[PDB]
């Protein structure tokens, strides 16, 4: 379907968009006490794999799944909350603020770099077709 460069750069754009979405969702839920069921929000992470279609030669980036972080959930002593345990510590998400802003900046700069790569390739693509005519 897609040309190889198109597929690689478009996969890069989609992967960076997914990472930015995960960062934004984490930054929104930084102060959430409960979900829809009664469990604390867990910071999400996105794992980049190389989609090496040929044997070890090249390939874009794919995202296998969005994993839930395994870090000590923040404990805040609020015994009056219905979600407090026997000891009374309500669970707040493990979303760090600085890491998510850094992730947003890095995802934006990778997105823009891949955009520039596509823009650069495009002129050569259109100029290839003048070879025959």
């Amino acid at each position: 379907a897609l040309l190889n460069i198109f597929d690689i750069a478009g996969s890069a754009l989609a992967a960076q968009s997914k990472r930015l979405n995960v960062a934004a969702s984490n930054l929104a839920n930084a102060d959430s006490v409960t979900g829809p069921d009664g469990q604390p929000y867990r910071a999400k992470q996105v794992v980049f794999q190389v989609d090496a279609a040929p044997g070890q030669a090249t390939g874009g980036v794919k995202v296998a799944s969005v994993i839930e972080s395994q870090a000590p959930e923040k404990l805040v002593y609020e015994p009056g909350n219905p979600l407090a345990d026997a000891n009374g510590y309500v669970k707040m998400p493990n979303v760090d603020v600085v890491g998510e802003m850094v992730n947003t900046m890095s995802a934006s700069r990778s997105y823009q770099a891949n955009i520039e790569v596509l823009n650069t390739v495009k002129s050569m693509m259109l100029k290839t077709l003048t070879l025959g005519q």
Binding site: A53, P54, A57, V121
Partner: peptide, 13 residues
Amino acid sequence: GGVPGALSNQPAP
């Protein structure tokens, strides 16, 4: 060969 060209159709068929 091992590397497909940039202007080739997606290696993934």
